[PDB]
Amino acid sequence: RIKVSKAAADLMAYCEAHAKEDPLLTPVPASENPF
Amino acid sequence: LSAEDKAAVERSKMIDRNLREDGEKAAREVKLLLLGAGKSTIVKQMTGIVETHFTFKDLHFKMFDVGAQRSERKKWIHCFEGVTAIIFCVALSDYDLVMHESMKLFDSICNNKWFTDTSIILFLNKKDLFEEKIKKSPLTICYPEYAGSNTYEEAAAYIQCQFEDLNKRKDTKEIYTHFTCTKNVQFVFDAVTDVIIKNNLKDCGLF
Amino acid sequence: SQITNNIDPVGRIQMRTRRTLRGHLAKIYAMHWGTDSRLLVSASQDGKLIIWDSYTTNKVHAIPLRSSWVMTCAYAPSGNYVACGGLDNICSIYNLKTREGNVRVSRELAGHTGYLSCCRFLDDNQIVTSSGDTTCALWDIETGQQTTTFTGHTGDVMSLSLAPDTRLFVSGACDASAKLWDVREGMCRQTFTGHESDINAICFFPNGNAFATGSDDATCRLFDLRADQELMTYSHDNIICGITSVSFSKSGRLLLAGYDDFNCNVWDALKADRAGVLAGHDNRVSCLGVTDDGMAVATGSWDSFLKIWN
Amino acid sequence: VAFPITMLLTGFVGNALAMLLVSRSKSFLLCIGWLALTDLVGQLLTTPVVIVVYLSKQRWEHIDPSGRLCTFFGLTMTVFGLSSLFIASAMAVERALAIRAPHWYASHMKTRATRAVLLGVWLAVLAFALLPVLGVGQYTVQWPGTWCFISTGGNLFFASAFAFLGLLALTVTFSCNLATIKALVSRCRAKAAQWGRITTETAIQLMGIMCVLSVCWSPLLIMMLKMIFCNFFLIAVRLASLNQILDPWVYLLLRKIL
Numbered sequence: 001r002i003k004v005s006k007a008a009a010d011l012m013a014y015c016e017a018h019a020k021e022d023p024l025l026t027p028v029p030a031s032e033n034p035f
Numbered sequence: 036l037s038a039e040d041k042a043a044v045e046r047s048k049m050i051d052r053n054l055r056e057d058g059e060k061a062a063r064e065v066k067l068l069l070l071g072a073g074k075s076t077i078v079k080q081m082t083g084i085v086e087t088h089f090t091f092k093d094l095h096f097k098m099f100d101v102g103a104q105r106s107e108r109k110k111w112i113h114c115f116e117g118v119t120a121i122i123f124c125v126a127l128s129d130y131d132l133v134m135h136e137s138m139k140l141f142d143s144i145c146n147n148k149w150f151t152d153t154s155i156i157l158f159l160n161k162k163d164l165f166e167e168k169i170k171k172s173p174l175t176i177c178y179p180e181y182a183g184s185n186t187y188e189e190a191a192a193y194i195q196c197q198f199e200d201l202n203k204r205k206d207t208k209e210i211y212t213h214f215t216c217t218k219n220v221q222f223v224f225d226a227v228t229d230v231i232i233k234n235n236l237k238d239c240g241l242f
Numbered sequence: 243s244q245i246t247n248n249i250d251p252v253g254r255i256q257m258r259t260r261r262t263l264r265g266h267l268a269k270i271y272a273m274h275w276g277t278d279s280r281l282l283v284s285a286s287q288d289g290k291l292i293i294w295d296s297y298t299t300n301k302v303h304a305i306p307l308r309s310s311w312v313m314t315c316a317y318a319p320s321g322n323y324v325a326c327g328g329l330d331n332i333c334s335i336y337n338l339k340t341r342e343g344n345v346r347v348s349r350e351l352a353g354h355t356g357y358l359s360c361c362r363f364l365d366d367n368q369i370v371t372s373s374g375d376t377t378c379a380l381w382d383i384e385t386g387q388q389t390t391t392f393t394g395h396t397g398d399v400m401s402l403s404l405a406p407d408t409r410l411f412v413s414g415a416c417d418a419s420a421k422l423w424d425v426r427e428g429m430c431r432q433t434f435t436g437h438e439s440d441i442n443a444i445c446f447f448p449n450g451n452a453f454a455t456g457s458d459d460a461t462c463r464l465f466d467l468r469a470d471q472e473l474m475t476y477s478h479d480n481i482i483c484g485i486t487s488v489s490f491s492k493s494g495r496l497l498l499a500g501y502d503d504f505n506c507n508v509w510d511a512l513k514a515d516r517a518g519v520l521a522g523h524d525n526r527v528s529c530l531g532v533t534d535d536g537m538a539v540a541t542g543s544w545d546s547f548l549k550i551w552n
Numbered sequence: 553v554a555f556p557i558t559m560l561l562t563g564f565v566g567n568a569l570a571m572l573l574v575s576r577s578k579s580f581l582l583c584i585g586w587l588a589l590t591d592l593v594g595q596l597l598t599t600p601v602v603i604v605v606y607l608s609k610q611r612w613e614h615i616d617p618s619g620r621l622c623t624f625f626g627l628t629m630t631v632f633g634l635s636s637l638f639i640a641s642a643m644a645v646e647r648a649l650a651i652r653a654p655h656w657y658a659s660h661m662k663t664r665a666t667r668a669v670l671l672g673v674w675l676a677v678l679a680f681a682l683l684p685v686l687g688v689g690q691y692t693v694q695w696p697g698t699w700c701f702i703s704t705g706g707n708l709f710f711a712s713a714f715a716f717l718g719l720l721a722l723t724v725t726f727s728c729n730l731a732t733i734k735a736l737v738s739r740c741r742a743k744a745a746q747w748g749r750i751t752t753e754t755a756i757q758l759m760g761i762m763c764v765l766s767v768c769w770s771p772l773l774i775m776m777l778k779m780i781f782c783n784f785f786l787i788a789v790r791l792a793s794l795n796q797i798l799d800p801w802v803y804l805l806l807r808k809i810l
């Protein structure tokens with residue numbers, strides 16, 4: 001078993017490394033948003 | 036907006052015409068469950084689930100004799116909410132054959148939260164074996180205070196009023212008890228034409 | 243959960259029903275987005291499995307079933323195959339890109355005893371099903387026989403979720419025990435028990451090394467496959483009903499849970515807060531899927547309406 | 553002077569409610585909504601002219617030369633007024649069909665005929681109101697000098713046909729409730745009982761309909777046949793509009809109310 005703080009760090013590192021490419025927390029303008 | 040889009044929308048409208056035609060054809064059919072604990076005799080004289088389709092006097096309705104699954108009642112019983120009746124079936128020639136389990140099942144079904152509007156038909160199957168077994172031996176053993184007599188008709192009426200008593204806190208559903216004597220499918224015919232009238236008088240809005 | 247309070251939370255989320263897909267008559271238990279991010283399927287008790295286009299909101303196919311009791315559906319990663327299963331104890335497979343115009347059934351997988359809860363494709367050659375007789379499986383379409391059967395629990399399996407690399411899945415069951423399986427060998431590897439009642443839906447965190455469990459006692463939890471224990475429970479004190487479906491977002495920051503008090507929610511999957519409610523559904527919601535591109539959700543419900551958000 | 557003021561605000565507060573209540577929530581809610589909407593519109597398009605006409609105190613012939621405004625007000629009353637009987641009758645025939653042929657009602661009347669015969673009642677009603685527009689009959693100003701109906705004199709054919717066609721509705725209604733009631737009682741008599749409570753609730757609510765349509769549209773229809781063959785006629789339209797006030801209340805309110 002790995003330390004749960006290390007797994008917490010890994011999940012928050014994956015959380016912060018894809019905040020730019022998320023169309024449902026920082027929405028794109030309606031020029032490209034296909035609906 | 037080329038010809039492709041217009042062809043696609045005309046295909047969509049043909050699909051919706053067929054879909055609505057099949058839907059309307061579906062709703063003039065009386066879906067009916069067949070819950071139980073002698074179901075085979077009943078479905079004869081009238082894996083997974085089996086649907087039996089039969090027509091009476093210009094009114095064909097299906098009948099869903101579930102019971103081969105035996106997995107859990109809590110997880111797939113809510114797909115049965117829209118249904119007209121429940122042909123429950125209990126043979127009453129098993130009062131002392133090692134009936135309390137059947138009463139527990141009826142208590143769990145009749146009080147269920149998805150079935151507060153479904154009129155539970157009930158059938159009591161084996162009566163000849165019951166009258167022979169009551170002529171030979173008494174039924175004062177299921178309860179120590181069960182019957183105050185030992186004739187056929189008092190015992191039968193006591194059992195019938197014992198099953199109809201478990202209907203807890205409902206004045207919206209109506210148990211239609213019978214005894215399984217042409218005139219065995221006549222009864223579900225004359226007791227499904229009494230729940231669709233109750234439903235029409237709620238449809239046009241009258242009570 | 244203790245470490246993230248130095249991270250700025252998401253403020254609030256506003257989502258609007260950008261379409262509404264109309265045409266079902268009975269209730270709804272399913273949907274599955276393609277990898278196209280374009281076409282969805284939906285399965286109902288009319289006996290109809292309808293493939294919808296999510297841009298023009300009109301039908302492409304209206305597949306007629308035989309057993310009108312479906313509880314799950316699947317849409318292949320090759321865009322060719324749909325699957326359906328339910329109380330018939332049979333997983334039917336239909337093919338779309340055929341020589342003729344009409345649609346037809348390819349293979350009738352007929353080897354279970356309980357009903358069907360899920361089914362998810364792997365290739366156009368491997369489908370993994372989960373059932374109500376406490377056993378998953380793994381099938382083979384042409385052969386017709388199951389090449390691996392997982393019998394690891396007592397509770398009936400209710401959900402299923404393949405990994406991003408499609409090498410090992412996860413299944414939670416009616417005995418609150420969520421197992422992590424392995425497709426190659428064919429036996430369980432860990433079992434997590436943290437829930438007080440049974441389990442209605444599970445999906446992986448999109449990385450592939452965590453998963454989220456939605457139970458029937460108004461709580462969700464987030465388990466990890468390397469620390470092997472609960473990290474958060476998400477619960478609000480004003481909930482009675484039970485979760486019915488669960489899905490994630492592409493960045494792993496929103497956890498959308500399909501509750502049973504008539505409306506979905508959005509859970510901050512790192513701070514355990516409540517972001518914003520997908521309100522307005524009339525009856526219970528049954529299913530919701532985020533696209534692979536991550537541009538929408540499409541919640542279905544017993545109201546006969548399949549609505550597409552944002 | 554206070555009668556149009558009372559019948560305006562009382563009818564408005566009666567029929568606002570039902571529109572709100574009905575809107576939020578079958579083949580009955582639309583056919584009470586289209587009764588409510590027509591009933592309110594017939595109260596909003598007719599009362600302003602009178603309320604205005606007698607603030608002033610002058611003869612209707614002075615304000616309207618050439619006889620157009622009476623022709624407007626002699627067609628509205630017939631049109632909005634008769635419909636209402638033809639909204640009450642349709643509902644009644646449908647309530648009979650339910651109990652008398654229990655299954656025919658399910659297959660054949662799924663909201664695609666509750667926008668058909670109901671939005672055809674207005675057409676049937678109207679290929680008759682526009683006959684003074686084509687030269688037969690005449691809407692003239694009556695004794696008060698604020699409203700208009702059929703002249704007493706080929707006009708009789710318009711005057712007698714109004715009585716005949718206003719009798720159809722009343723008759724149909726009474727027949728349908730008695731037919732329904734008789735069937736319900738006989739169907740409840742041979743049992744051997746919660747179907748009994750259905751009989752009490754319906755009996756009460758299918759006799760209020762049968763009494764309102766004979767306290768209100770009784771005098772206006774019975775005197776017109778004698779007129780074809782002073783003050784009385786004046787009350788004949790206050791009674792026959794009071795049904796409109798109460799139409800919104802009886803069908804979907806007082807039962808909820810009490």
Ligand SMILES: CCCCC[C@H](O)/C=C/[C@H]1[C@H](O)CC(=O)[C@@H]1C/C=C\CCCC(=O)O
Pocket residue numbers: 555556559560594595598599602629630632633634696698699789790792793794796
């Ligand atoms: C066949 C009759 C149909 C009429 C229906 C119409 O919607 C009735 C509304 C009334 C209201 O009750 C009083 C009023 O002024 C409205 C118009 C009718 C009365 C005109 C004469 C009123 C007066 O001079 O007293």
